[PDB]
Short mmCIF file of N, CA and C and ligand atoms in Angstrom, two decimals:
data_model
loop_
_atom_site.label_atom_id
_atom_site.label_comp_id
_atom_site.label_asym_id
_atom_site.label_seq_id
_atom_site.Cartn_x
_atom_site.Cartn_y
_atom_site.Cartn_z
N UNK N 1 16.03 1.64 -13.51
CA UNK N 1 15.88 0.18 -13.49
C UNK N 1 14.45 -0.22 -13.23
N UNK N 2 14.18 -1.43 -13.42
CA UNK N 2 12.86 -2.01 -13.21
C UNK N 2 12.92 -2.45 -12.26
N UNK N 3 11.68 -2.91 -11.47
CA UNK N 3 11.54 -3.13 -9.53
C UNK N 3 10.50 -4.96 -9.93
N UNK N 4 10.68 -5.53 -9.06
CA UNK N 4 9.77 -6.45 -8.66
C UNK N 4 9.58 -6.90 -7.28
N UNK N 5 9.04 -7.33 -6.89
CA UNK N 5 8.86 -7.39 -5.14
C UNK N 5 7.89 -8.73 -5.34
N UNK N 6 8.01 -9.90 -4.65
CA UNK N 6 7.74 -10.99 -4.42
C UNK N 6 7.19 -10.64 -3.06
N UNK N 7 6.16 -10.71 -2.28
CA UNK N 7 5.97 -10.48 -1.27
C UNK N 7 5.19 -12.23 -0.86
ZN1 LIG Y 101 14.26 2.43 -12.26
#
């Protein structure tokens, strides 16, 4: 899967 992270 693909990741994204909004920090
Ligand atoms: Zn993955």
């Amino acid at each position: 899967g693909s990741n994204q992270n909004n920090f």
